[PDB]
UniProtKB/Swiss-Prot annotation:
The lineage of its organism: Eukaryota, Metazoa, Chordata, Craniata, Vertebrata. The modification 5-hydroxylysine is found at K133. This is Splicing factor U2AF 65 kDa subunit. The gene is U2AF2. GO terms for molecular function: C2H2 zinc finger domain binding; enzyme binding; molecular function inhibitor activity; poly-pyrimidine tract binding; pre-mRNA 3'-splice site binding; RNA binding. The modification Phosphoserine is found at S151.
């Protein structure tokens, strides 16, 4: 079966989201983004594990599944959706593994360790993914971003990682944010290599 090549993991889903709302969101986004490859819905079903905070999407075609990987990081009800292959996915012969389209405004959640990867610590815990992304985007467009959540409670842990499109924005964000006081917290903004364990 092509079935594992027609399914995607979606993490960090909004609390209380229904399977139908998730399906409507992705079917509409696929059509609006020009990713859908025929009339009708590309997403057939959604299974939510509400307790563990993830969903699986099932698509009608291998190719539309691949294109939907381009939605990684899309904001849905304030949250950056983490879109991933199933762990047992294996590319089929002759079928592409990576998406061929770009979705304007969608920022990847995949932030690899790299020279200019930034750590941002001390963020107020009431800021959602969208608001932290907006804070960072004020300095320049992002290539990648993730805000770290507690996997049991879903609450922000108050620190994030990001990578700017322009490597030179990195030091501008550091200058603008490092050491800023918010309540009892003080932002630490530095390249993530500096304080990694």
């Amino acid at each position: 079966m092509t079935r594992q090549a027609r399914r995607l993991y979606v993490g960090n889903i909004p609390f209380g989201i229904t399977e139908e709302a998730m399906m409507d969101f992705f079917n509409a986004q696929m059509r609006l983004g020009g990713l859908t490859q025929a009339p009708g819905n590309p997403v057939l079903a959604v299974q939510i594990n509400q307790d563990k905070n993830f969903a699986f999407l099932e698509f009608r075609s291998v190719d539309e599944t691949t294109q939907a990987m381009a939605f990684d990081g899309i904001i849905f009800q304030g949250q950056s959706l983490k879109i991933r292959r199933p762990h047992d996915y294996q590319p089929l012969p002759g079928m592409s593994e990576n998406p061929s389209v770009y979705v304007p405004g969608v920022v990847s959640t995949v932030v690899p360790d790299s020279a200019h990867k930034l750590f941002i610590g001390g963020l107020p815990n009431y800021l959602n993914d969208d608001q932290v992304k907006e804070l960072l985007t004020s300095f320049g467009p992002l290539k990648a971003f993730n805000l770290v959540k507690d996997s049991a409670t879903g609450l922000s842990k108050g620190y994030a990682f990001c990578e700017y499109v322009d490597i030179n924005v990195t030091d501008q964000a550091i200058a603008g944010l490092n050491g800023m006081q918010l309540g009892d917290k003080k932002l630490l903004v530095q390249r993530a290599s500096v304080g990694a364990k």
